Ligand binder design. Structure first.
Ligand SMILES: [Mg+2]
Ligand SMILES: [Mg+2]
Ligand SMILES: [Mg+2]
Ligand SMILES: [Mg+2]
Ligand SMILES: [Mg+2]
Ligand SMILES: [Mg+2]
Ligand SMILES: [Mg+2]
Ligand SMILES: [Mg+2]
Ligand SMILES: [Zn+2]
Lengths: 129, 229, 146, 94, 175
RNA sequence: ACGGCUUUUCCGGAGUGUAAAAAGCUCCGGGAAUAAGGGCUGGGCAAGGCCGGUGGCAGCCGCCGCGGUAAUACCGGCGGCCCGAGUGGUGGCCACUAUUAUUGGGCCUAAAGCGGCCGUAGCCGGGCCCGUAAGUCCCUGGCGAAAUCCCACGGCUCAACCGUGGG
């Protein structure tokens, strides 16, 4: 049954855009989904999006640009110390400043490049590149 | 660089082409190797490369990976024929790899070296490791993977000075292309050099299938083809 | 086939139990924790032994070979068991007399066992009366006790 | 041999002075004890029978040796706190 | 547990019979006239350690990584192997033939004190050379930079007299 | 094969060193004089298409594999290759092995899906809002002996070893 409406979202995006689609409808829509999309757009990976309500959890219209290689979800959601990012970067991304590693810090959701500035940690949730 | 530059001036006369790219080349229109590739042509005349990459035949830009004789039975014994695998490339930015078949060893080598010029590709180089952060074209720009047969390879960037740490018949291919430092992680059966060679070739090809921003370029140093020879 | 069984965050115990239970289906780890080499082993965890010869024999080589390989029957000291040893070198069987104190090594085959065509021999003589058989076979030294 | 003295350090409790010097002698053996004692007792004009030479030793291929000597005000004090073997090696007592 | 055992300061090759490796090390042994291979791997390790040290201080950050960073350029250029304005990245482009140019043998030969490298070895090991006023009898000493100019003959050596029938053959080559 | 040179090492001799000795170190007299073995030589794997023995016998062989009267593979001689005051043999652990797999393995036909279904503990669990602060994150006090590990500098001829500082 439905256990993770975030993994479904990122895998559906990566299946769609790999074949050529220009729009997707993320069916169940948390505020955590939208909070990922907010920072997955700022770096230049998707177009623009809005929330279409239908009396049951709403949906998400997101239109692609054909500019991502692979997205997914770090599932066990390990915690990371503030000085120990590179160790996890050498497992997911393919170069020294490639992609982003979305972290759920104590002050919102933000890419690790903005966590190492303020020096904080938090559970990992997903990764895009 | 002269003897391998009068060679083209000698070849460019006694060659009356039959395809169309031949006409384009022999009429001075197309004049540089970097402009027959990303446009959807077909290449069937092996003299086109002798004129734009005249060094591909220098005997130190050539290589004979394996030779093996195979057999088929018949009611009058066994009929035995060879198979050679050969690669060619200037040690800058271009490689090719082909096979060829025959019933003796010079003829198989000849056809192999031929079909290794009609299977040529250009790659992307850079420096994407975590240790070295210079901007020089000695290594792969970012990890890539290519598969073949039953053999998966994965090529990881490595810091300047560390050599080539890969199998035996990977070193020849990665030395003919210009790469000088790399790491590696493989699977499957890596004793059949045909499949191992084709997986390394496919990984080097897949190098140019990853999307990059106009700013990631001046952070790894990605050069395409030659880079100030 | 599914994904993989206990990939949870608070699922440590089941994971450790799964791995510990499927480690026993191995055969090198089982043979080590139980200490099964010993108590089935006439040399008892040693790299040599010393025995007293009883007789001299010869064996037949394997299927696609032809010959007879010379050998001896040694009776150990620390146990009293009987092992079959093999004399290496061209003309060694001409020195081993009865009632000799010989030394005994392995033979170095796969899995510590036997090797080559000699199928059931797994020990080889090195010293006879404290004079290296290697020398005796090629001159270079004299033999004690007659 | 030519001697340079590097440290004369007094001592009011034991009642003595420590003399740290060094010999420079390229092409000659290590000096004797009689000879170093003579040069010292002529240089600083001490008593020639209360001064002891604790050690002189030569380093690896340096043609320069390091010494260290002790000199006493009272005689019997020396003969009381100083060990036995050093007086014999330096010949004072027998 | 166990106490400290002393450990070897070099590393062998992984496979002892790679062809294009023997034919590459054969050249360096004949050119500098080393005694045995164990004398050469010592320097290869002496270099690999530098590379492995400057390879960790470059993906690092903090207070004390900074302090150690500039203590690697310090020695690495006080020893002569780098120029006076080199950045950290140059430690990665060093080559074995740059260490082997710093043994005492090569320096006593690259200054006219000897006729040929296999003669400077005997000159040293019999005790005639003199590095900064101190006889040294080890031809593999890595000479520093602050003293490269102060190498002469011993003050009490037969060579230190410009009439020795051997010491005059020496400059018969410098022409 | 002729000419010269040196004395680290080697014999005697003098200082010094040491609780007394001995080693060691500085100076003298002689002398190139006193000082290279061990394993491999068919492929994996660097190195011979040479000579004489042996005739499915003797032997070799970690695995594949040689020997049947024309042996590059066994026994010698002559050549050559790798290490070198060392070099080979037999046992044990790690890597090799993604043949124990959290990173990171498999399950139609190759080893492996319970004959089928219900269900207890346990692991996994939809959307929104308001509190708490156990988990998790950052700052700061008290602890986790010395020796051991990495780095710079200094002392024994450099170095092994020892000291003063930073981790
Ligand atoms: Mg032979
Ligand atoms: Mg060979
Ligand atoms: Mg398997
Ligand atoms: Mg929920
Ligand atoms: Mg401690
Ligand atoms: Mg000193
Ligand atoms: Mg030091
Ligand atoms: Mg210490
Ligand atoms: Zn680089």
């Amino acid at each position: 049954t439905l256990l993770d409406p975030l993994a479904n979202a990122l895998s559906h995006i990566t299946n769609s855009e790999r074949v050529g689609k220009r729009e997707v409808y993320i069916k169940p829509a948390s505020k955590l989904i939208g909070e990922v999309l907010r920072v997955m757009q700022k770096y230049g990976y998707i177009g623009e999006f809005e929330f279409i309500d239908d009396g049951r959890a709403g949906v998400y219209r997101v239109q692609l640009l054909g500019k991502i290689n692979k997205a997914g979800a770090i599932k066990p959601r390990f915690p990371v110390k503030a000085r120990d990012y590179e160790r996890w970067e050498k497992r997911f991304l393919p170069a020294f400043e490639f992609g982003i590693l979305i972290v759920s810090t104590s002050q919102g959701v933000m890419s690790h490049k903005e966590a190492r500035e303020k020096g904080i940690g938090g559970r990992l949730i997903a990764y895009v590149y | 660089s002269q003897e391998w530059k009068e060679y083209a001036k000698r070849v460019l006369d006694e060659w009356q082409p039959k395809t169309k790219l031949g006409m384009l080349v022999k009429e001075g229109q197309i004049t540089d190797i970097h402009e027959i590739f990303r446009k959807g042509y077909q290449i069937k005349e092996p003299e086109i490369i002798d004129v734009l990459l005249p060094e591909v035949n220098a005997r130190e830009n050539q290589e004979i990976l394996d030779i093996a004789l195979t057999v088929r039975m018949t009611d009058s014994g066994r009929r035995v024929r060879f198979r050679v695998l050969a690669a060619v490339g200037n040690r800058d930015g271009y490689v090719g790899l082909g096979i060829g078949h025959g019933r003796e060893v010079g003829i198989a080598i000849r056809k192999a070296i031929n079909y290794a010029k009609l299977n040529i590709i250009e790659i992307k180089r850079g420096c994407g490791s975590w240790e070295c952060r210079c901007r020089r074209p000695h290594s792969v720009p970012f990890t890539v993977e290519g598969k073949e047969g039953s053999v998966r390879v994965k090529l990881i960037p490595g810091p300047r000075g560390l050599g080539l740490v890969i199998g035996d018949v990977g070193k020849k291919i990665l030395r003919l292309a210009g790469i000088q430092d790399v790491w590696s992680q493989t699977l499957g059966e890596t004793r059949t050099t045909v499949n191992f060679a084709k997986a390394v070739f496919n990984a080097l090809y897949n190098t140019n299938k990853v999307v990059v921003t106009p700013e990631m370029i001046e952070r790894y140093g990605i050069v395409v083809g030659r880079a100030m020879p | 086939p599914g994904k993989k069984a206990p990939n949870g965050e608070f699922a440590g115990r089941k994971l450790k139990l799964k791995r510990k239970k499927f480690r026993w289906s191995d055969i090198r780890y089982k043979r080590r924790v139980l200490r099964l080499k010993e108590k089935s082993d006439p040399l008892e965890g040693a790299p040599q032994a010393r025995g007293i010869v009883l007789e001299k024999i010869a064996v037949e080589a394997k299927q696609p070979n032809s010959g007879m390989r010379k050998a001896v029957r040694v009776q150990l000291i620390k146990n009293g068991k009987v092992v079959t040893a093999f004399c290496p070198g061209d003309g060694a069987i001409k020195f081993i007399d009865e009632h000799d104190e010989v030394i005994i090594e392995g033979i170095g085959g796969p899995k510590g066992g036997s090797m080559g065509d000699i199928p059931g021999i797994r020990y080889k003589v090195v010293k006879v009366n404290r004079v290296s058989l290697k020398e005796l076979v090629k001159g270079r030294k004299e033999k004690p006790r007659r | 041999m030519e001697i340079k003295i590097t440290e004369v350090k007094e001592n009011k409790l034991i009642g003595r002075k420590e003399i740290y010097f060094e010999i420079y002698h390229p092409g000659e053996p290590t000096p004797s004890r009689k000879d170093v004692k003579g040069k010292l007792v002529a240089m600083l004009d001490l008593n020639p029978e209360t001064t002891v030479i604790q050690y002189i030793r030569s380093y690896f291929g340096s043609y320069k040796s390091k010494g260290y000597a002790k000199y006493y005000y009272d005689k019997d004090r020396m003969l009381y706190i100083e060990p036995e073997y050093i007086l014999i090696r330096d010949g004072i007592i027998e | 547990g166990d106490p400290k055992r002393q450990r070897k300061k070099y590393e062998t090759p992984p496979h002892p019979w790679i062809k294009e490796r023997l034919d590459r090390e054969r050249v360096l042994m004949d050119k500098y006239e080393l005694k045995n291979k164990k004398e050469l791997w010592k320097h290869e390790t002496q270099l690999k350690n530098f590379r492995r040290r400057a390879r960790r201080l470059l993906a690092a950050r903090g207070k004390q990584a900074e302090i150690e960073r500039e203590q690697l350029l310090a020695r690495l250029k006080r020893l002569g192997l780098l120029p006076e304005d080199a950045v950290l990245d140059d430690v990665l482009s060093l080559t074995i033939e740059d260490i082997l140019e710093r043994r005492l043998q090569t320096i006593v030969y690259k200054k006219g004190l000897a006729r040929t490298m296999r003669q400077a070895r005997q000159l040293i090991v019999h005790g005639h050379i003199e590095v900064n006023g101190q006889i040294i009898r080890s031809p593999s000493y890595l000479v520093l930079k602050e003293e490269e100019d102060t190498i002469t003959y011993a003050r009490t050596s037969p060579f230190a007299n410009p009439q020795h029938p051997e010491r005059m053959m020496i400059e018969k080559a410098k022409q």
